[PDB]
Design a protein around this nucleic acid. Structure first.
Ligand SMILES: CN[C@@H]1[C@@H](O)[C@@H](O[C@@H]2[C@@H](O)[C@H](O[C@H]3O[C@H]([C@@H](C)O)[C@@H](O)[C@H](O)[C@H]3N)[C@@H](N)C[C@H]2N)OC[C@]1(C)O
Ligand SMILES: [Mg+2]
Ligand SMILES: [Mg+2]
Ligand SMILES: [Mg+2]
Ligand SMILES: [Mg+2]
Ligand SMILES: [Mg+2]
Ligand SMILES: [Mg+2]
Ligand SMILES: [Mg+2]
Ligand SMILES: [Mg+2]
Ligand SMILES: [Mg+2]
Ligand SMILES: [Mg+2]
Ligand SMILES: [Mg+2]
Ligand SMILES: [Mg+2]
Ligand SMILES: [Mg+2]
Ligand SMILES: [Mg+2]
Ligand SMILES: [Mg+2]
Ligand SMILES: [Mg+2]
Ligand SMILES: [Mg+2]
Ligand SMILES: [Mg+2]
Ligand SMILES: [Mg+2]
Ligand SMILES: [Mg+2]
Ligand SMILES: [Mg+2]
Ligand SMILES: [Mg+2]
Ligand SMILES: [Mg+2]
Ligand SMILES: [Mg+2]
Ligand SMILES: [Mg+2]
Ligand SMILES: [Mg+2]
Ligand SMILES: [Mg+2]
Ligand SMILES: [Mg+2]
Lengths: 105, 56, 70, 54, 206, 145, 141, 63, 143, 67
RNA sequence: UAAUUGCGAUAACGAACGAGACCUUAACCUACUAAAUAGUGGUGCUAGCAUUUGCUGGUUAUCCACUUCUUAGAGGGACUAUCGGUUUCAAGCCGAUGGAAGUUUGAGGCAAUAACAGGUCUGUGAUGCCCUUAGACGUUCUGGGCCGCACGCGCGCUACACUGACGGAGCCAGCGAGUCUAACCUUGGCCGAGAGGUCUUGGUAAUCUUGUGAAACUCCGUCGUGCUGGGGAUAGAGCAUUGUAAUUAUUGCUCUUCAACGAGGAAUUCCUAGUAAGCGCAAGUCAUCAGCUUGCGUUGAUUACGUCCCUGCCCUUUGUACACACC
């Protein structure tokens, strides 16, 4: 056990599934008494695509715009090596992309 | 590896589609109703939801 | 090319003696005196501010304004 | 190209001096759109084959 | 006026008028009255303002247009004809210029002088297109007070702009000549002429 | 800048380079009614001839007028960059020329005639009087010759 | 810790942050004194909030503002809203209330919105034309 | 020249094929206590003050 | 009282400072000056002829003084402007680099600007000396 | 224009009918009343109901209304 | 009423799809939980002015504090509320005050029954039938063509200038997007009149490019009404960039050449508020090429708050020999 100064990055398209896992990480750690920079939310990027609806060129020009919403979150902890490998192999979610790094760079 | 977060997330939804298709073509006679992919450590898990699993 | 591009000392003398009575002078009003074009009409707006005559009450490029001295 | 410039009967002057034909100005006018709801199959169908099918 | 300073100084004439009188670029909103009955409540003049810009929302309700400060309406109609749309900085600068010309000739708070050119240039009665059967005849009609101000504004501006086109004279100059000539109507102004010809064709067809 | 006075010393419409030049305009736009002199090349030679540009074409001492010309025909000697020049890398002697005035039309023709005498397509295009730069001829240019 | 309040004002996309603290009466915007500002026709629009409540009024307070967003004019409407707003905020939390409400009364009576953010916001362009309302053009035939 | 000033006392309706005219009853100001129905051009609300070029004349319909 | 250059309106500053570097005679004007334009997106060279290098450098210094550090690249986009494509719409374009660079390399060898860390150029401390000096002078003419 | 859809005026009708006690001429309290007493799927819709039951209540005090 | 939206009339009563509701996005939250990938004040370290103090910077951690401003979770807020007008004495409507906001708050996504021989077999490894299938209508390669020019038409771009061009100088956005077998976004440094070149560098990105220091615009001057310094078509000569390949000139740059156009006939398009109009930017195309599109913000008005005259459509009634429904 040594205090490793950790940075976790949560990124997903599903808000409920993202803030579930984030708030889950926030209470599971802080009931368990560590040093936390809580969920720090990053500007949700909206990736847009603009298309004509019709497959061919006939008809009035109807444009449609699809979008995909990417929400990104990051949580800073300092823990020992044991609660990191435990908290990060569990809390696994489909659709949430969890990233755990040790370093500032 | 080392892809943008953006391109990654759009690359993930491209994957689901191609798989969704492949299973709709392959398993049609088995009653394939759709898929979901859970990415884990060490594995990636593919769940076929189909009405006759024994021919799967 | 129509006229009034240079000096013609009579027109110098015309200017000094003809610009009282002008409650407003500008680059327009100085060509409307059947006289110099906007290049030397400006010049005269300077040289009439050399001493006496024109009191600036306005500012800048395009619109200029002056009144007679008191 | 040696043939190209040696050719009179060419160029802008010789085009400028020709009359423009009528077929240019005129509209395409469509056609046939009167007849649109009248099938040219000349066949039609049968109450039998519409009930066997549907 | 009891001057006061503090760390970053606010200058002499700046301080002076400022706290004291609410007046214009500098021009008196006191005095300056509307020479015509009606036309008040449709010519603004108190509340006083400093420069002709505003964020004003006058376009959301029918008659709030009237409450817009009169000079600002004028500089409003100044910025238009294509290229000159937007560009209120341009048009406001001209208004300060023309009023400095207006006062230059015949004193007379230039704000008052436009109040007159706007009151004299509203046509009292006009004509409309009524069928009258077949070939359309024209029923003479008494024009509303607001309209009388609108048209007044547009006419003067349109004239000045049309007038300033393609000659050495400057927009601020020609804005003044017209304003003055229409202030006490000379019929040497493009507005006075066309206020009188709408009322002349209004007398004939009545 | 100042009011000036002079005398009958200034003469309007002086002629140079076989062309005629309005006086009573500012001296730079005067030298440009010649063929081969645009606003830039005017502006550089005047600065190179040590001449006050605030002057009109009028005052402009005759000696000032012979330096203006000398510089014009010999730009590389008085140090004009030779990218500033209309005609570089001759295609026969490969010197760098500023071709001027009544000669501008001459060199133009010879250029054209080369493309023509050579059977160049670009030549054929001038010779039929059409657009050489490639542009769509189907629509534009119907008032034509 | 000196008495300090911090306010803002908005016009379109322009936001201007105003620090109003206890000071000797400096008024500067961004890096520069309130006396430049240079649209310069609109110079009085930024003078306005002072000379509406009286010039004095500011000598027990330092005034700093910094602006980002919008254009040359948009910013000018935001700093005047952020200067007016901050004055009432100060007299809110430091001087008495009847004085603050005599400051708002002196503004809101004159307004130009000094205390109230103008909600006008750009409309979305919709396909079929260059602007939000204005459609392209048609020829029929 | 006989200018006559008249205050709008009621809004009536819009007339004309185009509908760009408004029927109005006024009470003219000097020596009130007589009523006339005139036709307006621009927009009018109650209490507006109208300049009648000709004192007595009035209309009804418009096409 | 105290003074910084942010106490003086932009133009009278950069003018008095231009006239100051004109008087000065410590310059390094590259000599292609006057035979040049200052943008690929400009019609004519500048109208101040002899001068205008001291106009731009004066501005350059003023710009750099305000903010942390500014490269040649930033200067280009700044000093650039609308280029008329003729019959085609207007597009913004970067001004000429050699102008503003040798404006830096001249303000360096005059000790008014220095290479910064992080990149760019940074206002020399002898620059804030001189600048906040003539910026004092300019409200001294206005006294 | 501002008109209340049937599903708004049918709820309000259904409310004042059973709940006429409580249910006063103040929207705000009436608003919260709705939350406890009724299940409505959106903030917007609920307030629409409440704000109308307020109008109806408000003129009931001035004498009965049809329906 | 935006609405078969409602009131009301009532042999009907009470209801369902559609409208509404709903969802997304923009406006408001001195309070919720936080942020060296967002900033603020304090304190050190420190530069410059002047000042007995004070002003302006600089500083990736040097520490301490905070969440107004920036970010996004979850809540809250408007229901046309209060009051007054106006009406069947009704749903509603106008006005006022308040308010972030009172045009369905602004803007959209979704969208009943049906209709059409509308468009699309040139998006598809969607498809019936026909056609072809080895001298191929499969496919690849080489080279042209789709750009070809007496002319007719449509969407546009630039202009006729003095509300301007040109030269300095001032100097402000928002939506965006960016690179591993790879060459993407590119700060900075030097070379170059330019265009560009070159050595490095930060960025798989709230971290770097980027405050995308955009343009219109503001100010000080030069031009001074002259097809002019408005206008830049046409054309010559040269220098660069992409690409295997630039000729019929991909694009870019410098000199030169310097047309029509002096406000557009009959006509006809679009539009009501942060709109119209001016202005640029990013994204899509994409090696290179935007006068194009999709979005964005910057400047920011005049004039309606009506009618049924025109036109278009919906709705009653009326006639019919139509029902493959006036083709
Ligand atoms: C000066 N030469 C070129 C210069 O013209 C310019 O070209 C880009 C071009 O490469 C871009 O090509 C594009 O291709 C990628 C890719 C994922 O498809 C896009 O993400 C992105 O829009 C852009 N980088 C284009 N969209 C804009 C031009 N200005 O910038 C790149 C360059 C090599 O410096
Ligand atoms: Mg003019
Ligand atoms: Mg020439
Ligand atoms: Mg710029
Ligand atoms: Mg510029
Ligand atoms: Mg152009
Ligand atoms: Mg429904
Ligand atoms: Mg500090
Ligand atoms: Mg906050
Ligand atoms: Mg009521
Ligand atoms: Mg068909
Ligand atoms: Mg198809
Ligand atoms: Mg087929
Ligand atoms: Mg096929
Ligand atoms: Mg095709
Ligand atoms: Mg086909
Ligand atoms: Mg396709
Ligand atoms: Mg398919
Ligand atoms: Mg056609
Ligand atoms: Mg189209
Ligand atoms: Mg300019
Ligand atoms: Mg950032
Ligand atoms: Mg920004
Ligand atoms: Mg010309
Ligand atoms: Mg030109
Ligand atoms: Mg191409
Ligand atoms: Mg296209
Ligand atoms: Mg109606
Ligand atoms: Mg028939």
């Amino acid at each position: 056990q040594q205090i490793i100064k950790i940075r976790i990055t949560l990124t997903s398209t599903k808000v409920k599934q993202l803030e579930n896992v984030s708030s889950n990480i926030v209470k599971n750690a802080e009931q368990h008494n560590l040093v936390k920079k809580g969920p720090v939310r990053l500007p949700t990027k909206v990736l847009k695509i603009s298309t004509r609806k019709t497959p061919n060129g006939e008809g009035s020009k109807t444009w449609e715009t699809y979008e995909m919403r990417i929400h990104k979150r990051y949580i800073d902890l300092e823990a020992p090596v044991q609660i990191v490998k435990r908290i990060t192999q569990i809390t696994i979610e489909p659709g949430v992309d969890v990233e755990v790094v040790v370093a500032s760079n | 590896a080392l892809i943008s977060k953006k391109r990654k997330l759009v690359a993930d939804g491209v994957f689901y589609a191609e798989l969704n298709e492949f299973f709709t073509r392959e398993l049609a006679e088995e009653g394939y109703s759709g898929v979901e992919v859970r990415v884990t450590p060490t594995k990636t898990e593919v769940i076929i939801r189909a009405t006759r699993t024994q021919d799967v | 090319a129509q006229h009034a591009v240079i000096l013609d000392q009579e027109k110098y003398d015309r200017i000094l003696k003809e610009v009282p009575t002008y409650r407003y002078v500008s680059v327009s009003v100085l060509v409307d005196r059947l006289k110099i074009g906007g290049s030397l009409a400006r010049i005269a707006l300077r040289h009439l501010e050399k001493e006496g005559i024109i009191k600036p009450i306005s500012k800048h490029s395009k619109q200029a304004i002056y009144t007679r001295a008191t | 190209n040696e043939g190209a410039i040696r050719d009179k009967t060419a160029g802008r002057r010789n085009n400028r001096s020709k009359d423009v034909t009528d077929s240019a100005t005129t509209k395409k006018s469509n056609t046939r759109r009167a007849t649109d709801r009248h099938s040219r199959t000349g066949k039609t169908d049968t109450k039998k084959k519409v009930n066997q099918g549907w | 006026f009891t001057p006061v300073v503090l760390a970053t100084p606010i200058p002499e004439e700046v301080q002076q008028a400022q706290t004291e009188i609410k007046l214009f670029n500098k021009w008196s909103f006191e005095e300056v009255e509307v020479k015509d009955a009606s036309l008040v409540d449709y010519v603004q003049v108190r509340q006083p303002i400093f420069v002709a810009h505003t964020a004003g929302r006058y376009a959301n309700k029918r008659f709030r247009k009237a409450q817009c400060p009169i000079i600002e309406r004028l500089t409003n109609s100044l910025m238009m004809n294509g290229r000159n749309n937007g560009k209120k900085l341009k048009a406001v600068r001209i208004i300060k210029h023309t009023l400095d010309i207006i006062n230059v000739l015949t004193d007379q708070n230039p704000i008052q002088v436009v109040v007159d050119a706007i009151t004299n240039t509203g046509p009292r009665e006009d004509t409309t297109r009524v069928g009258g059967g077949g070939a359309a005849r024209r029923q003479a009609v008494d024009v509303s007070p607001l309209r009388r101000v609108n048209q007044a504004i547009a006419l003067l501006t349109i004239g000045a702009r049309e007038a300033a086109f393609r000659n050495i004279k400057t927009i601020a100059e020609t804005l003044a000549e017209e304003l003055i000539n229409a202030a006490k109507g000379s019929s040497t102004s493009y507005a006075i002429k066309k206020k009188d010809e709408l009322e002349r064709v209004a007398k004939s067809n009545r | 800048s100042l009011v000036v006075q002079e005398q009958g010393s200034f003469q309007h419409i002086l002629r140079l380079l076989n062309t005629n030049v309005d006086g009573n305009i500012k001296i730079v736009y005067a030298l440009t009614t010649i063929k081969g002199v645009g606003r830039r090349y005017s502006n550089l030679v005047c600065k190179k001839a040590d001449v006050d540009l605030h002057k009109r074409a009028g005052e402009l001492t005759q000696e000032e007028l012979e330096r203006i010309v000398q510089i014009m025909q010999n730009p590389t000697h008085y140090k004009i960059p030779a990218w500033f020049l209309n005609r570089q890398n001759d295609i026969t002697d490969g010197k760098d020329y500023h071709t001027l005035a009544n000669n501008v039309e001459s060199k133009l023709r010879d250029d054209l005639e080369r493309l023509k005498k050579i059977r160049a397509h670009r030549g054929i295009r001038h010779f039929w009087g059409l657009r050489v730069r490639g542009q769509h001829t189907k629509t534009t240019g119907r008032r034509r010759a | 810790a000196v008495p300090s309040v911090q306010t803002f004002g908005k016009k379109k996309s322009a936001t201007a942050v105003a620090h109003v603290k206890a000071g000797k009466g400096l008024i500067k915007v961004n890096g520069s004194p309130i006396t430049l500002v240079e649209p310069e026709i609109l110079r009085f629009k930024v003078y306005e909030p002072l000379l509406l409540v009286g010039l004095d009024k500011f000598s027990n307070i330092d005034i700093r503002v910094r602006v980002t967003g919008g254009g040359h004019v948009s910013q000018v409407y935001a700093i005047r809203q952020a200067i007016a707003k901050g004055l009432v905020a100060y007299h809110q939390k430091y001087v008495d209330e009847q004085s603050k409400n005599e400051l708002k009364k002196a503004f809101t009576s004159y307004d130009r919105t000094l205390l109230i953010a103008d909600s006008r916001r750009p409309e979305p362009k919709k396909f079929g034309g260059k602007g939000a309302r204005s459609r392209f053009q048609k020829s029929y035939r | 020249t006989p200018v006559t000033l008249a205050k709008v006392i009621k809004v009536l309706g819009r007339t004309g094929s185009r509908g760009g005219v408004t029927q109005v009853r006024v009470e003219f100001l000097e020596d009130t206590s007589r009523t006339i129905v005139r036709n307006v051009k621009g927009p009018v609300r109650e209490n507006d003050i109208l300049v009648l070029m000709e004192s007595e004349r009035e209309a009804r319909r418009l096409r | 009282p105290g003074v910084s250059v942010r106490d003086v309106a932009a133009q009278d500053f950069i003018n008095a400072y231009a006239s100051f570097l004109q008087r000065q005679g410590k310059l390094e004007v590259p000599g292609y000056v006057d035979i040049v334009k200052t943008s690929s997106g400009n019609e004519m060279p500048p109208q101040d002829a002899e001068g205008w290098f001291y106009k731009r450098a004066a501005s350059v210094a003023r710009h750099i003084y305000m903010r942390k550090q500014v490269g040649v690249g930033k200067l280009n986009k700044l000093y650039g402007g609308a280029k008329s494509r003729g019959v085609r719409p207007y597009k913004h374009i970067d001004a000429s680099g050699s102008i503003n660079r040798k404006v830096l390399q001249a303000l360096e060898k005059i000790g008014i600007v220095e290479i910064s860390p992080k990149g760019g150029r940074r206002i020399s401390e002898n620059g804030q000396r001189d600048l906040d000096r003539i910026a004092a002078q300019t409200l001294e003419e206005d006294e | 224009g501002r008109v209340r859809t049937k599903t708004v005026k049918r709820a309000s009708k259904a409310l004042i009918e059973r709940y006429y006690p409580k249910l006063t001429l103040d929207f705000q309290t009436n608003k919260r009343l709705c939350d406890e007493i009724a299940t409505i799927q959106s903030k917007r819709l609920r307030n629409k109901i409440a704000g109308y039951t307020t109008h109806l209540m408000k003129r009931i005090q001035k004498g009965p209304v049809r329906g």
